[PDB]
């Protein structure tokens, strides 16, 4: 007797499009976070301030 | 200089230890031969002493597998005035 074979992907979804919302406002820091003098700056492997 | 004779016995004892490694460790062989070669040149150029030492090494290295030892050996026999042995 064949068992209930439940290995198939009963759905193949696909990510059709992408929205890249980037709120950087490069330069001016927001009021919340006071940043350090050296600080973590790299953004997608780019120094924005350069 | 009187202690030298005994020193050669310890040379041969510790060389016999490096025949045990040589028969067990194929990866260590060419290092051992080089060690062996460098060691013999610090040792004195008397023909008896060399013969003793080479017989030990002959437990696992035929004379064809290391010429330079045996030519230098033959050369000592020539310089020391024992050409019969040098010939053999």
């Amino acid at each position: 007797k064949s068992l209930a074979q439940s290995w198939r992907m009963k759905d193949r979804m696909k990510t059709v499009s992408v929205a890249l919302v980037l709120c950087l406002n490069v330069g001016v820091d927001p009021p919340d976070v006071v940043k350090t003098t050296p600080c973590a700056r790299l953004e997608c492997w780019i120094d924005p301030l350069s | 200089s009187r202690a030298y004779g005994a020193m050669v016995s310890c040379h041969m004892l510790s060389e016999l230890e490096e025949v045990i490694q040589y028969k067990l460790v194929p990866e260590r062989r060419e290092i051992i031969r080089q060690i062996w070669w460098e060691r013999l040149q610090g040792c004195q150029r008397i023909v008896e002493d060399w013969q003793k030492i080479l017989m030990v090494r002959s437990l696992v290295v035929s004379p064809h597998e290391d010429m330079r030892t045996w030519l230098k050996y033959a050369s000592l026999c020539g310089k020391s005035g024992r050409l019969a042995l040098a010939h053999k």
Binding site: V33, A40, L42, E43, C44, W45 | -
Partner: protein
């Protein structure tokens, strides 16, 4: 939903890392995975790896 932090937490300000640390992990793992490897105590085991 994927989110960089728990509600109380703040993102790290550490000058060695990117600001974009989470996005960087999700989207360029091998790049931060190697940079992170070089910041740990386990680098002592491989000298000449800056």
């Amino acid at each position: 939903q994927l989110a960089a932090c728990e509600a109380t937490e703040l993102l790290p300000m550490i000058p060695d890392l990117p600001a974009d640390l989470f996005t960087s992990c999700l989207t360029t793992p091998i790049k931060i995975a190697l940079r992170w490897f070089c910041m740990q105590k386990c680098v002592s085991l491989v000298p000449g790896v800056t």
